[PDB]
Symmetry: C3
Subunit: 455 residues, 3 copies
């Protein structure tokens, strides 16, 4: 059989698993070993977006699950534990396993139990693993997926950085950025109409202060998985090119491409060389996913500018919107304060500040000045101050036709922004009212709910 | 021109066409021939799922249509007959034909008529053929697609088994597994929201007793088509790897991959070597298709276990759900008995038995015992017996919070199963009531319809 | 760095940009140059379909935007102007640019302004460029995408014809072919449910008298982009095969394929050799896109028939429906006349004539004769004449069961055609009534609206 290099030798190895976005060290070994993998399923609430909770089902407490790294020809003794706090039974199917269910029938594990099975890793490559418990789509949609790397016997070529990025489509009862604990929505899942499309299980998991890092001149390998359950990723890096893309354990290697399709349940190894400094965006280039559902991750490159290659500026909020900033923690704080009934004006102002970036600043500017005659000012705006209820209607339903703001005529079009949630409109307008010599006061989520109910 | 090896020689050959999942023998020929292909369009009702009828439009009486096998450089004389019972006109477009419409303008055929056209098979490869009659999407959605293989002149490498598997997306007015004759739904088709995603034109067409077969050590070639009309298949084999994947007549061959994207209207040849015994599942890994819409097929491998490669068990209903069993004929029988007005308790019990597998057994076990303190028993359940109407509400709408069953406390969550149809809930609960010393009696589809109407 | 061949030499070149479907001449140069690209954003109403207006946002006044052609190693000085009539700010991200945002942060341009940035073209290949202004999906959905070709240093192999074809998905408030100025629909865009899927920004942009042309024996290169924003194209040529397909700047080249997947934001170079005369259809083979949403383009090959290769007829309206004809200008004229309140019977008749092709003629024939006993006549039809209101109901809601037409019995099924708009049903039936010795008169859109409101 391929990838059979004899029985295990040396000592049994306890696999060291890593949490995303990090990868275990290269196995750096010339002999086949018995590798003991211990993975524990944990069901738990986590933030899928600021102020939005979701009950994830996880391998190892993360989405995606712990990264497993072995060598082709290793005997893997796989232990799956199901934490006693679990409500569901779980199991595992690893791609790249040779045998029925990729482990599923022998890994069936009730809450508080443990199962084990053994397999030889015959197939080199990068592989998705996932839960295989009826209803299979529900388990995978709740975050039950990760990657296993089966190294070639000589190891992969040395790089400066290895990272772990996995896309998933998620199905909430509520709309995108609707606050609260969001249940799983089976109807959206069956229709393949996700509310979120994420890297590593949350909006902003790999942006701002959670960006991946490297330096000019360094090489980066990324193990990229698509857990699905349903979407195919038009996986793309903005402002850069992949030196190589290799799918699973495939013989074919594509070189010098920027855009590549990753099947549902598929995995690829990509390699990048950093040439110039700045933020490189990993996206699903089915563009409403990347810019309206959360499918964006950042690789931040530090080092010397090369004006002969690129004369231009670092990414800002015009392109990355509200993810240009280090974090949106102010949104989480305002949401918690609403729940507790302690929401202050300043809690709203700081949340609105975070959300104004891109969403409003692209036209009205970061300082609210606009552009005289083209985009009207929000800074010390007589039109804003004259009618705060009309301002709520303008955000939700748009504005067009001739208006006068601060003594100048505008005759343009502000598109409707009906996709903003009531708390988002309230916090943004509270921010604007409390900035730039505007009159202060506040807009409440209830205020906006009433305007939404009758335009 | 490529693939032109002179005029036809020998005798004219009458092509021998096969029904899925079988393929005609290798042409085994060193000379170009005149090949006469006779294909007849038949419109007819068939079971798309147990107790669910659909009017298919077929090439040769099957979905997918009869497999056509010729050699590169053959002159093909193509005869399309439209059966007199047909209501629609039909035609054909074969991929791999060199000429406008791939045959469409010269194959236009009214009910009870016959058309013919001739083409040289210049392009080697595996190709989709399909109907090309306005409205083209409706004809293809009704099952009007198949494969034509144009062998290379030296033939393909010898294998132990060749099979024919074709994916299709289907659009019923009714929901998944809603019983009766289901009309085509143009609105779902335009929106690309299929009710079924199938291999070979039915749920269970290639599962249980209709599985594909081979033995350990044997090689299997599968000609895989995607008739669409609309979906792209994340085509995957669970627990195995493809030795080779080749698309259409492409020069590129990918090797050692498990997951591959097949375009709408695309076709690939895959090759598999059986290493260990068990059931290998072919799926569209857009996972709600495979596990909620019917997109699963089985290759069953017989032979000696190899514990050094895989220590684990054969696939069961935890992963394959209600398709683990040889067939679900009891569902078809119960549906026919409802139509006739002769439905008995035992008809319901046998249907419920089939549907309980996976759907309920994953948590409550095949014997209804559950797991004390974790999953409550359905076997001799005081809680079930106390309130059969509450049991209908629990299946449709779920259950959570503290309950007492057979003297033990449970504090867990049973998800809602609202996607089950009224007859399915009725038959499952009738099965449970008539098993395991439960009190007997029955639940009717009308009973469940009323509970669904007011939770 | 790759593709760095020293500083620019010779004179600065002012790039000559072309409108689709044409491409600039090969750069035909042995030295790296400074290339000055000037591109202007124009927002403007254009016909997305006959009688259907849309406000496109364009690079250079077209969808897709002006084609840019440079050589690997050129220094590109990129000037983006935003026309003063613009309401939105715009920018650019070019795939294949090495640097953050592919130009986005340094190309931010308010109406009536100009921005510039410089980049070295290190990466050879074909690349999408698009707007990168929040909300990014809205800008791309409004048509803000095109192609840039970075030639290899020795140039591409010489061909007879080069063309420029780019797919896009579009999101109108109204349904497909609903007349009037159609606003952008953010809700459809987020759900990835386009109303139109087009080549080069309109239905019929590359059909009939706007077809691409070549002659038997000639080679055609097509630069194929997928602007998205959301869809993946199952890109296919009907009745022909691609000699080569190469994605972006990839090392891999696939040969001899008919069907290939182009990611959202992806681009490919395809090469075709014309073997026999006729119309070759480029489609997205997600078939409801091609035949129900506009995703069809034609390459028309003139020259000598080769009966040894293909004995069959040129494409007609059975396959291409209402796009078989040179244009559907009569629909545009009837729509304008309705708006003006000058709609005549003959305006309706000429519009109906155009729309009857395929839609009705596939069964009732181009002359309305039908096929005795199989498809009833519309020519001098007693059944039509007896009840014009019943004819409106038959088009919208279908007909089945026994009928008598012109003294012969029919017992067949005419499917419902509810997707036709009220003006389309009115114009088709006015055409039929005024043809073939039928009694004349007219059906109005208001007539059909009332029948639609109560079947
Ligand atoms: C450009 C695409 C804009 C974005 C994004 C947002 N706004 Fe806007 N806004 C814009 C225009 C062109 C106009 C004038 C419309 C016209 O009829 O000419 C406006 C107007 C407003 C107003 C009222 C006028 C004023 O006080 O300056 C308000 C209060 C306003 N806009 C607020 C606002 C907020 C809060 C935004 C993000 C949520 C936002 N706008 C986005 C253009 C654009
Ligand atoms: C796990 C994912 C389950 C599946 C699949 C099904 N059921 Fe279930 N069921 C489950 C739990 C954890 C509970 C207890 C909930 C709580 O509040 O603690 C239940 C409960 C029931 C009951 C009532 C209690 C009893 O009689 O044991 C019934 C009647 C029941 N479940 C039926 C049932 C059927 C018929 C199923 C398939 C259609 C099914 N359940 C699936 C967990 C799970
Ligand atoms: C085949 C797929 C058809 C298409 C496309 C259209 N029509 Fe049709 N039509 C068809 C049949 C088989 C029948 C008879 C149905 C039966 O019960 O046997 C009809 C009937 C009509 C009629 C009434 C009878 C007559 O006058 O001949 C009308 C007025 C009619 N059809 C019109 C019509 C138009 C305008 C179409 C395009 C919009 C059209 N039909 C499409 C079969 C088919
Ligand atoms: Cu699980
Ligand atoms: Cu899988
Ligand atoms: Cu047909
Ligand atoms: Cu086709
Ligand atoms: Cu723009
Ligand atoms: Cu892009």
């Amino acid at each position: 059989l391929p990838g059979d290099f004899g029985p295990p030798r040396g000592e049994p190895i306890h696999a060291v698993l890593t949490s995303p976005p990090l990868v275990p060290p290269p196995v750096n070994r010339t002999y086949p070993a018995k590798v003991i993998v211990e993975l524990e399923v944990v069901e738990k609430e986590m933030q899928i977006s600021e102020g939005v909770s979701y009950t994830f089902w996880t391998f190892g407490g993360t989405v995606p699950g712990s990264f497993i790294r072995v060598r082709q020809g290793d005997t893997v003794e796989f232990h799956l534990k199901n934490h006693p706090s679990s409500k569901m039974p779980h199991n595992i199917d690893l791609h790249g396993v040779t045998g029925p269910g990729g482990g599923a029938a022998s890994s069936f594990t009730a809450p508080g139990h443990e199962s084990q099975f053994t397999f030889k890793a015959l197939n080199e490559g990068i592989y998705v693993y996932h839960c295989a418990t009826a209803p299979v789509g529900m388990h995978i949609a709740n975050g039950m997926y990760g990657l296993i790397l089966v190294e070639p016997p000589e190891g992969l070529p040395k790089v400066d950085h290895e990272y772990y990025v996995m896309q998933g489509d998620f199905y909430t009862a509520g709309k995108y950025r609707e606050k609260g604990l969001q249940p799983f929505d089976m109807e959206k899942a069956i229709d393949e109409r996700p509310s979120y499309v994420l890297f590593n299980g949350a909006e902003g998991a790999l942006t701002g202060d959670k960006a991946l890092h490297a330096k000019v001149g360094e090489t980066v390998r990324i193990f990229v998985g698509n857990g699905g359950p349903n979407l195919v990723s038009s996986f793309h890096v903005i402002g850069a090119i992949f030196d190589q893309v290799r799918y699973e354990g495939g013989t074919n290697v594509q070189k010098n491409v920027q855009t590549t399709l990753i099947p549902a349940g598929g995995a690829a190894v990509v390699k990048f060389t950093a040439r110039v400094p700045g933020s490189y965006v990993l996206v699903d280039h089915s563009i409403f996913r990347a810019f309206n559902k959360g499918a964006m991750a950042i690789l931040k490159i530090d080092g010397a500018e090369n004006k002969l290659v690129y004369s231009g500026k670092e990414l800002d909020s015009v392109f990355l919107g509200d993810r240009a900033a280090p974090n949106m923690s102010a949104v989480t704080k305002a949401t918690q304060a609403s729940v507790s009934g302690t929401l202050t004006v300043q809690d709203q102002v700081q949340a609105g500040r975070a959300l104004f970036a891109g969403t409003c600043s692209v036209c009205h500017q970061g300082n609210g000045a606009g552009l005289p005659g083209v985009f009207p000012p929000l800074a010390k705006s007589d039109f804003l101050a004259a009618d705060p209820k009309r301002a709520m209607n303008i955000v939700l339903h748009g504005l067009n036709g001739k208006i006068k703001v601060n003594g100048q005529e505008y005759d343009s079009v502000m598109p409707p922004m009906t996709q903003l949630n009531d708390d988002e409109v309230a916090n943004i307008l509270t921010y604007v009212l409390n900035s730039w010599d505007n009159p202060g006061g506040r807009v409440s989520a209830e205020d906006v709910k009433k305007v939404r109910a009758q335009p």
